[PDB]
């Protein structure tokens, strides 16, 4: 019984057929369906051996189509006829045709409106985007239907900005340039998204709240909820998103300005005039939305499964990911959920015969992530207090491949040793790298932009179930999966992301007919959880925190010296943070000597207490501004696209346009104030690796 | 070795010495004595066998008169000539007639100003006291000068209450009714205030900020500071405290309404008239302050002393009490300080011996307390993330005597059965009951209002340094000390509190002569300490938690109950509140059983783990509402005196007053807002007792 056991145990086949198992039906978030399949999980895993396995189930805030009176948008004629519609579903793949409870496309939490208006259209919706537009091209977004395709940034950022410039309601649409790999056929003959094909998903901003009525609180059965003018990260304007055979109709009669350049032209025969409104011949003519979605308080279900430490149950190493999907879900979430689901099974197969990890390992089966993360959320603040003192990591388990071509890892520097050594421990599944370790094949594809003979590592940023426990409760989290070349691709994702194509069919003809990357992923997933929960010594390495601390000062200095006068005027000294890191640095060497050179038990879970306190460590209990839910001071969801990690983020935001702001003084004290914050936190948490007394 | 070895060696001809070694010059925080001060007792505390012994400075917003422009008020004529003037100082007591740097009277942080205007008398500026004048007797305070006897509340709370009705200054005076006991001879002769005796005092509304300027973190020697516009918790309106031969002087020609009944009449040969203004013949003359103080960032000390644990060093038991005093500190705070220098000196006789407690001990002399609380505050600040992980419980240690009747313990319902054991085994210094224990004569002298044979035990409320550790950080705190008898002493505090005449000689003829009252508060905190830092199972029972919960949550229901229709209205139900503390109290009698029932160190540890982490679980990270760092949802400062604890202060304040609000179903909607919370936050800590998993 060691991690090689736990390791052959895991099989393709299974994870093949879980995932055939769970992608037959849509498990939409708060729906019958998927209440069942809460059940199922449920009882395999009591089967599988856990020691107890339970429903924690929570009334939040969802959003649904009226299926009575269904979302579509209109060109309007001058005496208000409709003289095209958008489509009111996608059409349906090969032998599902007569599924029922599809939901059609819409956009989750769009308030009710017919809006009726002129185009302008904004590229990406970014900030970028709508600075280039207004500062740049003159253009007055306000009182326009925006419409923008989707890539680069989360699509509530989109959203956002769309309301900041004054639109009064957003289309977004999918562009064949972001959505079409060149050569491959749209499905179901290939892996491309086809013209009728439209990308769901939530446009909330809800910055880490979790239920939009109850933020800081679990939805329970006696919450006090707020109200809907209350609620949190709702956006204002209606939104809808739609394919790029309508985005086409949409687009080809725009007149106005020429798009400013080429990175504003998508791959669609029409000339990417940004507007306002329609060519000479067409003028009067104008875009009308219908959207008739309502808001519902529904319940929803985590599945939390329990295996108890024999020597340390009171440490807690959780594996997490969500089992709510917009319709079948074959990618997203339940090539993940599958692979949970053959984790649990190896780990109760070893239990069976009388093993038990050293720590705790719960596992989770998360509800409602699609509409904001709103089941691992409110769990966590249900279970915030045991979560704070106990918990040791959280390893994610959304979709465990996007691609074919090489492993992705995003975590935390506590786990990048871990991560290493593992993946040298690994057989490579690729071809060409036969008996070779994934180590190799990944560092060879994917080498670290940093370093030699290294492989890249991320940060983790946003977008998914271990938001709450990372930037909420500072809890060091991983997450890994297979991936695309993203050298050689240029598309945003893979493109049937969120749509009824997204089918067990996909993924068993194109992505991965023999299993082996999800094999590979479970793998690594499974490791970490396994070394995390069973190795003596806490296998995190708090010098590698040390190295990139150095790195992002280094990059936020260099931010704030495109302002050399300012720098001079104000006084701004980053002095403070290089020193914090400079001890940081000093103070994890010395910690590392002392672990590697102590039978006393005390002692161990003494230096143990202080590897699992030290994420802990960079949690601010004040929160970054006007954003309470993000409390971790070294990394947060880009305030630009919620799915991108941004280091010191309180500095990246105080210097962000720096230069545009009407008080400077004011504008560089809060870059002053954010760096004392920095250099604070990360004294503070260097001095939690010191001699305790 | 063991705890009696360790209260054998305490002295009380020891702490008689160290009182008058510290009393003997003023030491002021921010001056240079009270640093000499600091030097002193750190050297001693190394000499005493302490393992560290180290200064922690910040640089603090303090206050101070201005030397060459001294405060004072007047009564001016109609030609502006100043008729009567307050005094510059208190007439200094015998043999001190010739020290030099006593500051006069004055009341830290007023802003400057010479306000000049009509007076209105508003007894102690109480919430009720403003209330009975604006509602009943239609006064209206707006652009008056108030003046108002010191006593029954925080005087803090008093100069809020005083602005808020639209006050231009505050008088604040000692009435002998409230600082002159019947039948008791004036400093020298006796412990009673002179009439020209005066009491300082900051007069801040900090919420447990600590330092007006960088409130969340230490202020240190790269902190950004708020500008004085932004700064925490000062007041608008001038303000200074004056003796009751001045008060009377001011008093004795005012008119307009009479005091509405006896309850507001002092014990002056004066009408108590209300005002505005003076009587007929004075009618032209108004009252005139001059202040001048100002407010300036000073360095501050800390003594932090660290005694290391032999088996536990990663856990803290903290013994903590100021150094600064407003002039010599007789009693306030050198009678506490005195006793915690015994203390260390105790605890490192047996350590020589080679002995040293399981957990570690650190012992602290805070700086600033009188400012505001500044020095543990910004420690704290500093240290907050050891503190939060590894802190166990925090004993204050301020003024050891305030009478000569019996004891007095505040402290969490974690501490009380601690509390009940120790004083069975401590003698009682009470004349009449030679040979017994203190718990019979504490019994005896003030019983429990709640429990046959047992001594009443308070809730922790604030002013003193507990503060940040208990209702910000939620480490269990308690204090003790000796007091008057409050059945048949109706005066408040002791009458010479924060005056010139608190000096050693005040202590040693009229306290406690032969130093007994201070050897058994020495021995109930070091006992405390000692049984805290030694006992292999933490001396806490959360059963005790589980029997206040459901007296307070009756407590807060009865409040509601006063507003039957309402409640029935916008269906008001506690049944969540009452749910939750049942759950508490079967959890805690479960929790119970298995602490009495378990060789196995993990499972100890484990347990003393969820012992120290269930004060910690009552901390809500968000704090009540715009008081972010009162965090505790059982406890907080009550909001209309700093000094009293209030019980479920969420709901208790959503409640108050809450027939006056204009919008009712706003109101009831945050009262069932906060029963929530608390309920939740009950339940939360409830289920830190739970088995782990
Ligand atoms: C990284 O770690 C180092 C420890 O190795 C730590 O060094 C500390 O730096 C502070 C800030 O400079 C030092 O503060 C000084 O303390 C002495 C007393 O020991 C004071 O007399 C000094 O104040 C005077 O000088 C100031 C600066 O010119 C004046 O502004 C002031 O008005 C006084 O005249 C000063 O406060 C401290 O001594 C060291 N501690 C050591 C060396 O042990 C450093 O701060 C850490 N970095 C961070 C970001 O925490
Ligand atoms: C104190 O401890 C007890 C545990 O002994 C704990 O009891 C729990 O109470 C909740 C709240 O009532 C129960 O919630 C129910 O759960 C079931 C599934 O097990 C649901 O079907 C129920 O929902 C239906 O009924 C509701 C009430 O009428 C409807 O509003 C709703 O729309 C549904 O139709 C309901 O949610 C829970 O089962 C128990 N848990 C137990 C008994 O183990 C109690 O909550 C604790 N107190 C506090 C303040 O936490
Ligand atoms: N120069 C260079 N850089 C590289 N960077 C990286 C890599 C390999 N690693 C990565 C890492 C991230 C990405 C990427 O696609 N990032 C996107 C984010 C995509 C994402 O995280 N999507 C989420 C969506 C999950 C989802 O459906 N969530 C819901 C709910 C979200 C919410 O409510 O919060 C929703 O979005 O609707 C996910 O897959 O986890 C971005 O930052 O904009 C790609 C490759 N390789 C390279 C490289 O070879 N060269
Ligand atoms: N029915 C009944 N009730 C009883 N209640 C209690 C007791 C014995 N216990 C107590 C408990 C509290 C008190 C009391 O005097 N309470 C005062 C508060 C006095 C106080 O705590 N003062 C502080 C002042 C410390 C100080 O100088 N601090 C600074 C800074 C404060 C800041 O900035 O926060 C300042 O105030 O200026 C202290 O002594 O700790 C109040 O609640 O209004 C008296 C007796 N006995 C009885 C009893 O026999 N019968
Ligand atoms: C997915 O697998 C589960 C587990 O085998 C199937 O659920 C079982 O179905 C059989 C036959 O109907 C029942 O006797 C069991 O009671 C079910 N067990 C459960 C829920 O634990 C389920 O049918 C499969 N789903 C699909 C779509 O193939
Ligand atoms: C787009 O959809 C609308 C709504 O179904 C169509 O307009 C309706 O047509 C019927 C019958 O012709 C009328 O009686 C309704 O009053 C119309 N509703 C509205 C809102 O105009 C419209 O024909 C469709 N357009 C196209 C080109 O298919
Ligand atoms: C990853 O593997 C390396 C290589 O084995 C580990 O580093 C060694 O650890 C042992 C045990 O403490 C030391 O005696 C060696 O000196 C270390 N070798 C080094 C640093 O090259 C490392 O600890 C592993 N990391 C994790 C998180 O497990
Ligand atoms: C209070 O006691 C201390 C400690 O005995 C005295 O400080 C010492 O004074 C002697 C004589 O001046 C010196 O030799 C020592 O260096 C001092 N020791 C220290 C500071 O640790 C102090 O004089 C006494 N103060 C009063 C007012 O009596
Ligand atoms: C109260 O104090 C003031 C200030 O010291 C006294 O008034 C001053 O008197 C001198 C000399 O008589 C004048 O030249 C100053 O101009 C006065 N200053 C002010 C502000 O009026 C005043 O006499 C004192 N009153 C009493 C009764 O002692
Ligand atoms: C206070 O003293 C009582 C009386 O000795 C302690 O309660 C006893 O503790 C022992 C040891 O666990 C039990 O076997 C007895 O049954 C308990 N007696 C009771 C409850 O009457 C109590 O634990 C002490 N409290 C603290 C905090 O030390
Ligand atoms: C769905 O739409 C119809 C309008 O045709 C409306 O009457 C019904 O109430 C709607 N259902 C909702 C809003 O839940
Ligand atoms: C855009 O246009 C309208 C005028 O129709 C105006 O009210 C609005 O303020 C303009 N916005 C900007 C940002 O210039
Ligand atoms: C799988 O790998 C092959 C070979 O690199 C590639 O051509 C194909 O596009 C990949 N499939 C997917 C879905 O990425
Ligand atoms: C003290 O008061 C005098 C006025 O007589 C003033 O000139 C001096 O600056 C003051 N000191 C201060 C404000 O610190
Ligand atoms: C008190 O009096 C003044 C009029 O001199 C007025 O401005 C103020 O609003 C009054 N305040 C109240 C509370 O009635
Ligand atoms: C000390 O005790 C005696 C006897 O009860 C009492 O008369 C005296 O007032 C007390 N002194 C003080 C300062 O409380
Ligand atoms: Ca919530
Ligand atoms: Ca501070
Ligand atoms: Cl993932
Ligand atoms: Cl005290
Ligand atoms: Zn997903
Ligand atoms: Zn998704
Ligand atoms: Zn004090
Ligand atoms: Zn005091």
Same mark, same amino acid.
């Given at each position: 019984h060691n991690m090689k056991a736990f390791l052959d145990e895991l099989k393709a086949e299974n994870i093949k057929k879980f995932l055939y198992n769970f992608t037959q039906i849509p498990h939409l978030a708060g729906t019958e369906q998927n209440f069942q399949l809460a059940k199922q999980i449920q009882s395999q895993?009591?089967?599988?051996?856990?020691?107890?396995?339970? $429903?924690?189930?929570?009334?939040?805030? $969802? %959003?649904?189509?009226?299926?009575?009176?269904?979302?579509?948008?209109?060109?309007?004629?001058?005496?208000?006829?409709?003289?095209?519609? #958008?489509?009111?579903?996608?059409?349906?793949?090969?032998?599902?045709?007569?599924?029922?409870?599809?939901?059609?496309?819409? %956009?989750?939490?769009?308030?009710?409106? /017919?809006?009726?208006?002129?185009?302008?259209?904004?590229?990406?919706?970014? #900030?970028?985007?709508?600075? +280039? $537009?207004?500062?740049? /091209?003159?253009?007055?977004?306000?009182?326009?239907?925006?419409?923008?395709?989707?890539?680069?940034?989360?699509?509530?950022?989109?959203?956002?900005?769309?309301?900041?410039?004054?639109?009064?309601?957003?289309?977004?649409?999918?562009?064949?340039?972001?959505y079409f790999a060149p050569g491959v056929k749209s499905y179901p003959d290939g892996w491309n998204l086809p013209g009728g094909g439209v990308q769901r998903g939530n446009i909330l901003n809800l910055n880490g709240a979790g239920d939009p009525l109850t933020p800081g609180y679990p939805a329970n059965e006696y919450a006090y909820r707020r109200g809907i003018a209350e609620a949190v990260g709702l956006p204002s304007i209606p939104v809808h998103p739609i394919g790029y055979y309508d985005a086409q109709k949409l687009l080809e009669k725009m007149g106005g300005s020429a798009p400013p350049d080429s990175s504003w032209r998508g791959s669609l025969k029409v000339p990417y005039n940004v507007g306002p409104g329609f060519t000479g011949n067409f003028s009067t003519q104008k875009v009308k939305m219908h959207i008739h979605s309502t808001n519902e308080v529904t319940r929803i279900y985590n599945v939390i499964g329990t295996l108890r430490g024999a020597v340390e149950p009171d440490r807690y190493v959780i594996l997490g990911g969500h089992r709510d999907s917009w319709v079948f879900g074959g990618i997203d979430p339940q090539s993940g959920a599958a692979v949970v689901h053959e984790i649990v099974r190896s780990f109760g197969t070893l239990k069976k015969e009388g093993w038990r990890p050293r720590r705790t390992i719960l596992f989770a089966s998360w509800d409602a992530a699609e509409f904001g993360l709103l089941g691992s959320t409110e769990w966590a603040e249900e279970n915030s207090r045991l979560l704070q003192e106990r918990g040791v990591a959280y390893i994610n388990a959304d979709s465990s491949i996007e691609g074919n071509y090489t492993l992705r890892v995003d975590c935390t520097p506590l786990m990048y040793s871990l991560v290493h050594n593992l993946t040298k421990e690994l057989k490579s599944p690729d071809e060409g790298f036969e008996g070779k370790s994934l180590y190799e094949s990944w560092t060879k594809k994917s080498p670290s932009p940093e370093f030699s003979g290294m492989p890249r590592i991320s940060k983790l940023g946003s977008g998914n179930d271990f938001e709450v426990f990372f930037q909420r409760l500072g809890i060091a989290s991983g997450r890994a999966r297979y991936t695309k070349n993203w050298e050689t691709n240029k598309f945003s994702g893979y493109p049937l992301y969120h749509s009824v194509y997204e089918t067990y069919e996909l993924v068993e003809k194109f992505?991965?007919? /023999?299993?082996?990357?999800?094999? #590979?992923? @479970?793998?690594?997933?499974?490791?970490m959880v396994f070394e995390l929960a069973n190795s003596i010594v806490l296998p995190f390495d708090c010098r590698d925190y040390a190295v990139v601390l150095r790195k992002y000062a280094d990059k936020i200095y260099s931010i704030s010296m495109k302002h050399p006068q300012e720098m001079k005027t104000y006084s701004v000294s980053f002095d403070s943070l290089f020193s914090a890191v400079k001890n940081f640095t000093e103070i994890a060497s010395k910690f590392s000597e002392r672990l590697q050179d102590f039978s006393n038990p005390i002692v161990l879970r003494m230096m143990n207490d202080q590897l699992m306190f030290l994420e802990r460590a960079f949690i601010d209990p004040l929160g970054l501004p006007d954003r309470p839910f993000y409390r971790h001071v070294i990394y947060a969801p880009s305030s630009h696209n919620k799915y991108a990690?941004?280091?010191?983020?309180?500095?990246?935001?105080? $210097?962000?346009?720096?230069?545009? +702001?009407?008080?400077?003084? +004011?504008?560089?004290?809060?870059?002053?104030?954010?760096?004392?914050? @920095?250099?604070? #936190?990360?004294?503070?948490?260097?001095?939690?690796?010191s001699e305790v007394a």
């Open positions: 895993w009591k089967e599988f051996g856990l020691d107890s396995v339970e $429903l924690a189930h929570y009334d939040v805030l $969802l %959003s649904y189509p009226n299926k009575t009176h269904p979302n579509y948008i209109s060109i309007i004629n001058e005496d208000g006829n409709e003289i095209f519609n #958008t489509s009111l579903f996608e059409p349906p793949p090969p032998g599902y045709e007569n599924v029922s409870d599809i939901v059609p496309p819409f %956009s989750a939490f769009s308030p009710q409106g /017919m809006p009726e208006g002129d185009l302008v259209y904004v590229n990406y919706a970014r #900030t970028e985007d709508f600075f +280039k $537009l207004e500062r740049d /091209m003159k253009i007055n977004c306000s009182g326009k239907i925006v419409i923008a395709r989707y890539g680069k940034v989360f699509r509530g950022n989109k959203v956002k900005n769309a309301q900041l410039a004054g639109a009064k309601g957003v289309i977004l649409y999918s562009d064949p340039a972001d992505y991965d007919p /023999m299993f082996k990357y999800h094999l #590979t992923v @479970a793998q690594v997933r499974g490791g990690g941004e280091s010191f983020p309180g500095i990246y935001d105080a $210097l962000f346009d720096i230069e545009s +702001k009407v008080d400077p003084s +004011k504008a560089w004290g809060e870059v002053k104030r954010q760096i004392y914050v @920095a250099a604070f #936190t990360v004294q503070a948490a260097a001095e939690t690796l």
